[PDB]
Design a protein around this ligand. Structure first.
Ligand SMILES: CC(C)(C)CN(C(=O)CCC(=O)N1CCC[C@@H](C(=O)O)C1)c1ccc(Cl)cc1[C@H](O)c1ccccc1Cl
Length: 335
C-alpha cells in the first residue's frame, strides 16, 4: 500500500527469490510482519558475514542492531557482500518496521537483540562440541523459528502455544540450518568458513579441509552420515510443530522449507558428491514438494518416504548405522 513498503517487497524478491510468493500468501497482518522480519534478518546476517568489518567494529554493530531499528537515520555504507543494498537502504526497512503493530515490532527487536549477542560471541570461535553447534544454530536460525512463531501467535492466527513452545520452534530452525551447513561443506571450505563441529570431524581427520582430499573420501562420508544423523533428531519436533498449525498460509510457509530440507538430507546421505560440489534437489522435484506440502498427512508421508529411503541406504559398516536406524524408527513409530 505504500512508497517504501513497495521497495521492501522489491528487496524481498531480489535476495530470496522463489520463496517471496509463500511469504506474500501469509494472511492478514502476518504478511508484512514476516516480510519485514525477513529483511531485518537479511541485514543482520550481512553484517555478521562481512569479513571486511573488523571484530572491534562488528561487535558493537551486532550488539546494537536491535536499537538501530528505532533510529530513523541509521545506515551502513561500507559492505562487500551481495545483499549490501538492505544495509545501504536500511532506513527504508526500519521505517517499515516502525509502522508495524507494536506487538510485532517488540518480537522482532527482542530476537535481534538476542541473535546479535550470540553472533558476536561466535566471531572468534569455530564450533567445537555438538552442544556448541546447537548454541551456534540457536543464535543464527533457532531464534528465527522462535521469532516467527511469536508473530504467528501474536497475530492470533495461531494458538499461543505456537509462540510459547521455544524448543519446538528452535528445532524448526536448527533442522534447516544444520541441513544447509551439512550440504554447504565444500563452498564453505572454499570461502574459508568452517561450521562442521570440530568434536565430530576431529574423530575422522586432522583438519576439516582434509575431507576435500580424495584419499579421505570414505572418512568424509562417515562424518557426513554422522552429522546427518544428528540433524534427523529434530524431525519429531518438526512434526509436533507443524501438527499444531491451523492457519493454511502459515502451514505452507512453515512446511515448505522443512520438506525441502528433508529431501536435501536424503540426497546428501552417504553421498560422495557433497565433497566435490553442491548437491541440490532438482527444480521439478522442489516444485512438487512445495505443491504437496499443504496438510499433515501429506507432509508426514513425504517425511516417511525419504526416511525409508535413507534407511535402506545405510551401510552396515557405517559407524553411525544403528543411531541412524534408531532415530528413523522413532520418527516412523512415534507417529
Ligand atoms: C534461518 C534459516 C535457517 C536460514 C532458514 N530460512 C531460510 O532458509 C529462508 C529460505 C528458505 O527457507 N527456503 C527453503 C524453501 C524455499 C527456498 C527457495 O525457494 O529459495 C528457500 C529462513 C530465513 C528467514 C525466515 Cl523469516 C524464515 C526462514 C525459514 O524459511 C523458516 C520458515 C518458517 C518457519 C521457520 C523458518 Cl526458520
Amino acid at each position: 500500500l505504500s512508497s517504501s513498503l513497495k521497495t521492501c517487497y522489491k528487496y524481498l524478491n531480489q535476495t530470496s527469490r522463489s520463496f517471496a510468493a509463500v511469504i506474500q500468501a501469509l494472511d492478514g497482518e502476518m504478511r508484512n510482519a514476516v516480510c519485514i522480519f525477513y529483511l531485518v534478518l537479511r541485514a543482520l546476517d550481512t553484517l555478521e558475514d562481512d569479513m571486511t568489518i573488523s571484530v572491534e567494529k562488528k561487535v558493537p554493530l551486532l550488539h546494537n542492531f536491535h536499537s538501530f531499528l528505532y533510529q530513523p537515520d541509521w545506515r551502513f555504507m561500507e559492505s562487500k557482500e551481495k545483499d549490501r543494498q538492505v544495509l545501504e537502504d536500511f532506513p527504508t526497512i526500519s521505517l517499515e518496521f516502525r509502522n508495524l503493530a507494536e506487538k510485532y515490532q517488540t518480537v522482532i527487536a527482542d530476537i535481534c537483540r538476542r541473535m546479535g549477542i550470540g553472533m558476536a560471541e561466535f566471531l572468534d570461535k569455530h564450533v567445537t562440541s555438538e552442544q556448541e553447534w546447537d548454541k551456534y544454530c540457536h543464535y543464527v536460525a533457532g531464534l528465527v523459528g522462535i521469532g516467527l512463531s511469536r508473530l504467528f501467535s501474536a497475530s492470533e492466527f495461531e494458538d499461543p502455544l505456537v509462540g510459547e513452545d521455544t524448543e519446538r520452534a528452535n528445532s524448526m530452525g536448527l533442522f534447516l540450518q544444520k541441513t544447509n551447513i551439512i550440504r554447504d561443506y565444500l563452498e564453505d571450505q572454499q570461502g574459508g568458513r568452517e561450521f562442521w563441529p570440530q568434536e565430530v570431524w576431529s574423530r575422522y581427520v586432522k583438519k576439516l579441509g582434509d575431507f576435500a582430499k580424495p584419499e579421505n573420501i570414505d572418512l568424509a562420508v562417515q562424518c557426513l552420515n554422522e552429522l546427518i544423523t544428528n540433524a534427523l533428531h529434530h524431525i519429531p519436533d518438526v512434526i509436533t510443530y507443524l501438527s499444531r498449525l491451523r492457519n493454511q498460509s502459515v502451514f505452507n510457509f512453515c512446511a515448505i522449507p522443512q520438506v525441502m530440507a528433508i529431501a536435501t538430507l536424503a540426497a546428501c546421505y552417504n553421498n560422495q558428491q557433497v565433497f566435490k560440489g553442491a548437491v541440490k534437489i532438482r527444480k521439478g522435484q522442489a516444485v512438487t514438494l512445495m505443491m504437496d506440502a499443504t496438510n499433515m498427512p501429506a507432509v508426514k508421508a513425504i517425511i516417511y518416504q525419504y526416511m525409508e529411503e535413507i534407511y535402506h541406504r545405510i551401510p552396515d559398516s557405517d559407524p553411525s548405522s544403528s543411531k541412524t536406524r534408531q532415530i528413523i524408527s522413532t520418527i516412523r513409530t512415534q507417529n
